[PDB]
Write a protein that binds this ligand. Structure first.
Ligand SMILES: CN[C@@H]1[C@@H](O)[C@@H](O[C@@H]2[C@@H](O)[C@H](O[C@H]3O[C@H]([C@@H](C)O)[C@@H](O)[C@H](O)[C@H]3N)[C@@H](N)C[C@H]2N)OC[C@]1(C)O
Lengths: 60, 159, 185, 51, 171, 230
RNA sequence: AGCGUGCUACUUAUACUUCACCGUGAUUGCUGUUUUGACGCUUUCACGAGUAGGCAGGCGUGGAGGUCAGUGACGAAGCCUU
RNA sequence: UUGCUUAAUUGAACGUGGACAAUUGAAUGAAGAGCUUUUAGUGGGCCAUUUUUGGUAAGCAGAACUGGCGAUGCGGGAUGA
RNA sequence: GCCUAGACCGAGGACUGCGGUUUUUACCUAGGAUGUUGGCAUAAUGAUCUUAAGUCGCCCGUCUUGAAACACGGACCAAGGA
């Protein structure tokens, strides 16, 4: 009495291609989330030291 | 009812190759992966730890993280009208360097060498690849090669 | 028939005139439309499009942001240009002598500029004394500091502000926000 | 305001292609070709007739 | 006018192992050169294991009738496909060119066997030089002594709708 | 005052154009000599191919012509009921209406492109006169995203002069002999908007030319079709 | 005037080509002549199917502020009328 | 540069300074690209070729890709989503 | 290269451009039709109404995958009506 259509993927790719399918956008610096914590911890100190060394070198 | 478990439908994809069962040859564990390498994902059925999902079997991605026994690979997956950045942790038994990249680096080296040669020689070299062109003209001799006539053959039965 | 590669009859989607009905704003638009049409100085085209902007797209510019703009290397003598309102900032310890061109000055901002020997001038005066926008510096206010912007893109793990009328312990701090109440998204 | 076919309008033809005057005046379209009467197929190529 | 006879000569593309590939010729009855080269590649792909992509056409040439105003009897050997199988057959035609006899053969197998052009392979067309090489009586009866015959019941084709005189069929 | 100013302004125009015409007279010499040089090399190319064929017959050899480098592709199918991949291919060839025609340089990449669109196009190898007739009658240039008639050599030179294309005959030469800047010249040409053929098509179009239809490669008969449609 | 096949011409869709006109979108230029319209004028090109639905520009009705020192018993409003 | 790593002056990641400039490293195209807010209707579908399941089968029931009808007139199939 | 038979159209509105003939700051077929002649203005000419002929045209609204439906509401008109 209420038997109806169960499932179909008809028209679904047509809908997806109206405004997609968009590639995700890339950046020069990726987020360091999910990167190994030990590496990320030391990478903080390396970037900090580089900034100080460059600031000192620019000073003299 | 229906069954949609984690490894459903992987009966053949996760089987080992014929007469290729048993221990992993150690070259798998001696390869070195760096962040930014391009790797192919292939599940090894004998290593149940750090496996890909069946979706990532046969996909290729970028290494973004390196741990004790595994790498993190970035994959783009289509979900509806856009891609989603996926991050998968894979033990190195399920990963392999991609060969096309090493070929492309070969081309970069060769191209720099040629441009340096032309620079130091006083000429200019064109370095874009080109698709196959139509062939040019040519003259064919008949010395020992008189054209031989062929005809369609009659029908025959071999029962 | 045509196999259209793009959508037909699409308006550009950029505002080509102020929605404002102010006659004096339209006088300024007339001036800078002439200037952008006859001068090929990029400053005039930028000023022309800026006059079209809506109120939220012209955030107020504080005098402290102006003074930080004037501390750039070589910018102490520039004419600061604001297409919008310049507001006063009492957190500012000191303000220098400067020329500022703006649509509007609040009373405190104008008093502060004039007391330090500066010049608070309008955009037609700027056009008369810098028809190409020579030695100008355009300063824009913070667009994303609006309170409405806190609630844009709200969703699980997005870390945005919920749309809520009261704030307190009983208002949306339970299930869904706390692992002790089920889950936390 | 009106596109004129150079293949039909002579003035537009000469406006676009000045060499059209030299082509016409030199009768390039009906130019004779000097050469000798030859029959280069009389040998093996006559295998067009039978193999 | 439907068909012409062509020769088509081709070979494999030269390679390091085989710098001088053999040249192969075919005699093709086709409406134009595009169809002629297509037929050549069709037959070369069926006989030898060569594809179009690895070969090249060397020459395409009209083969004209030697004696276009000499009455001839031709024997034609055919392989054709019916609705139910594949058959060989031999028929005879009278014409002044090979192309004329081939066009007649195509019409004839269309008429009597419902055999379309795509279903027929022309094995061989031979000019029958002797009266003893002519086998079929439907052409043999036109090779007899002092042949003559009337054309009874001539129907004249009129240029008007209405005729003021009674019809006649004398001739 | 108005009458004297216009007479004063007209004589300014007349004096100014007396100088431009001198400066234009030198440039018209350049394009004249180029077209004279192109005509010479076309005839020299034709006679040399004839000579090489005749020499091959004598020396018991076969001369194989250089494979065609150029095709002209006409869309002869309407815009309804096209599968996605040939539809995209036809869009990438700028063939977005029935009876639109473009020039395509032949390589492996473009050959596979045209392979995809085969049951919707008619194409072949255009002759020199066909190219000239198409460019002269239905030649339009893409100037600032606008279809502009190629009615003056100034229009051609202001848009392709940086590629050493200064005249309509330079453009025709660059198309016919597939030159270094075939890409820019062919993309500058708006897709040709042809009529239906005078005399119609064959009884049924949408099957290959080989099987008696109208689609695919017809290899010298594209010129007869274009004469029907141009 | 049936069936198989080849050919020549011919017929005609809101399709294609050229031209006219309407609209939409873009586009050229316009202040010592910008001059009482610059929300205007002007050069050029492309495009036009549509339910549900969205938006835009307009037409019409009762009443209100302002204006036309507006119409009207020499006929307002209403109504009938190739 | 680093607090990570190496027996190590080994590496890892990110850099300073110097070299390579329009063939910046395949084709074709590109009424341009990117970003944001907000809200309508809808959430019964059906048909055709091919693949395909249950069923003797069905103008039957159920999936896959595509194109359509629904939402669409027009020329043709006499008539017909 | 030349000769030759018909049809449809005439947008724009001082000049400005590109070319051509050079006889020359002139002329041209070269940035869109002009010349000339007859008739009529008590009229041919155009527009609408009625009707005849040719051709095409099922009853709207609605729910629906699908309506002209042997699915539902609607005899007609005015005023009210979300
Ligand atoms: C080589 N495999 C073929 C596969 O190519 C395909 O063949 C189609 C064939 O089915 C189509 O034919 C189909 O569609 C036509 C019509 C509606 O187009 C019908 O007349 C026909 O009955 C129907 N079988 C035919 N027109 C093209 C082939 N490539 O489908 C059949 C197949 C056996 O799987």
């Amino acid at each position: 009495m209420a038997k109806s259509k169960n499932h179909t993927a008809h028209n679904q790719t047509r809908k997806a291609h109206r405004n997609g399918i968009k590639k995700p956008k890339t950046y020069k610096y990726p987020s360091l989330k999910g990167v190994d914590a030990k590496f990320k911890r030391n990478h903080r100190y390396a970037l900090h030291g580089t900034a100080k060394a460059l600031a000192k070198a620019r000073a003299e | 009812g229906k069954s949609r478990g984690y490894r459903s439908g992987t009966r053949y994809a996760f089987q080992r190759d014929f007469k290729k069962h048993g221990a992993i040859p150690l070259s798998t564990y001696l390869k070195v992966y760096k962040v930014g390498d391009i790797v192919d994902i292939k599940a090894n059925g004998s290593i149940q730890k750090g496996m890909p999902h069946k979706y990532y079997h046969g996909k290729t991605g970028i290494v973004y993280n390196v741990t004790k026994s595994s790498v993190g690979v970035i994959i783009n997956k289509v979900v509806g009208n856009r891609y989603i950045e996926k991050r998968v942790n894979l033990r190195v038994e399920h990963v392999k360097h991609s060969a096309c990249r090493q070929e492309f680096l070969n081309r970069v080296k060769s191209n720099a060498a040629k441009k340096r040669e032309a620079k130091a020689n006083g000429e200019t070299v064109y370095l874009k690849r080109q698709a196959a062109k139509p062939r040019g003209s040519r003259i064919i001799s008949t010395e020992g090669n008189i054209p031989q006539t062929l005809a369609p053959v009659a029908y025959e039965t071999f029962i | 028939g045509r196999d259209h590669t793009s959508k037909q009859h699409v308006r550009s989607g950029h505002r080509t005139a102020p929605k404002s009905d102010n006659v004096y704003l339209q006088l300024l638009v007339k001036l800078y439309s002439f200037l952008a049409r006859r001068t090929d100085a990029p400053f005039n085209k930028v000023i022309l499009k800026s006059l079209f902007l809506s109120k939220i797209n012209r955030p107020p510019v504080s005098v402290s942001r102006i003074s930080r703009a004037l501390k750039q290397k070589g910018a102490a003598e520039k004419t600061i240009v604001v297409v919008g309102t310049v507001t006063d900032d009492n957190r500012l310890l000191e303000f220098p002598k400067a020329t500022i061109a703006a649509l509007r000055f609040t009373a405190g901002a104008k008093d502060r500029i004039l007391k330090n020997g500066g010049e608070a001038i309008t955009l037609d005066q700027l056009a008369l004394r810098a028809p190409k926008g020579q030695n100008t510096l355009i300063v824009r206010g913070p667009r994303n500091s609006r309170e409405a912007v806190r609630h844009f893109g709200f969703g699980p793990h997005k870390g945005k502000a919920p749309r809520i009328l009261s704030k307190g312990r009983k208002f949306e701090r339970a299930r869904g926000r706390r692992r002790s109440r089920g889950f936390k998204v | 305001v009106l596109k004129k076919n150079p293949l039909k309008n002579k003035q537009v033809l000469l406006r676009l292609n000045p060499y059209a005057k030299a082509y016409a005046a030199e009768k390039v379209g009906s130019a004779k070709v000097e050469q000798a009467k030859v029959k280069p197929s009389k040998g093996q190529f006559a295998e067009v007739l039978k193999n | 006018s439907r068909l012409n006879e062509y020769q088509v000569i081709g070979r494999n593309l030269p390679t390091e192992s085989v710098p001088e590939p053999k040249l192969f010729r075919m005699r093709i009855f086709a409406p134009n050169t595009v169809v002629a080269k297509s037929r050549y590649w069709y037959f070369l792909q069926k006989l030898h294991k060569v594809k179009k992509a690895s070969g090249e056409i060397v020459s395409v040439n009209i083969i004209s009738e030697a004696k276009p105003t000499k009455v001839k009897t031709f024997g034609i050997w055919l392989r054709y496909e019916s609705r139910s199988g594949i058959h060989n057959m031999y028929k005879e035609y009278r014409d002044v060119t090979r192309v004329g006899a081939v066009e007649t053969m195509y019409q004839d197998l269309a008429a009597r066997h419902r055999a379309r052009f795509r279903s027929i392979h022309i094995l061989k067309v031979v000019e029958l030089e002797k009266t003893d090489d002519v086998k079929r009586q439907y052409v043999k009866q036109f090779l007899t002594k002092d042949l003559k015959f009337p054309l009874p019941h001539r129907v004249q084709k009129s240029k008007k709708l209405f005729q003021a005189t009674a019809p006649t069929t004398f001739y | 005052k108005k009458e004297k100013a216009q007479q004063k302004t007209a004589e300014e125009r007349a004096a100014a154009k007396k100088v431009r015409k001198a400066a234009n007279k030198e440039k018209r010499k350049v394009i004249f000599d180029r077209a004279a040089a192109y005509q010479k090399e076309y005839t020299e190319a034709e006679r040399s191919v004839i000579k090489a064929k005749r020499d091959a017959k004598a020396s018991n050899s076969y001369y194989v012509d250089a494979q065609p480098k150029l095709v002209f592709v006409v869309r002869i199918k309407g815009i309804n009921k096209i599968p996605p991949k040939p539809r995209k291919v036809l869009q990438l060839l700028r063939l977005t209406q029935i009876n639109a025609g473009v020039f395509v340089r032949l390589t492996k990449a473009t050959s596979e492109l045209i392979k995809l669109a085969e049951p919707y196009v008619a194409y072949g190898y255009p002759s020199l006169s066909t190219i000239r007739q198409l460019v002269y009658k239905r030649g339009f240039g893409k100037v600032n995203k606008q279809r502009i008639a190629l009615s003056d050599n100034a229009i051609i030179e202001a848009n392709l002069g940086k590629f050493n294309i200064l005249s309509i005959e330079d453009l025709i030469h660059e198309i016919y002999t597939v030159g270094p800047n075939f890409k820019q010249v062919s993309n500058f040409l708006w897709p040709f908007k042809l009529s239906n053929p005078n005399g119609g098509f064959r009884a049924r179009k949408f099957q290959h030319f080989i099987q008696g239809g109208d689609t695919g490669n017809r290899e010298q008969f594209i010129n007869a079709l274009v004469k029907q449609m141009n």
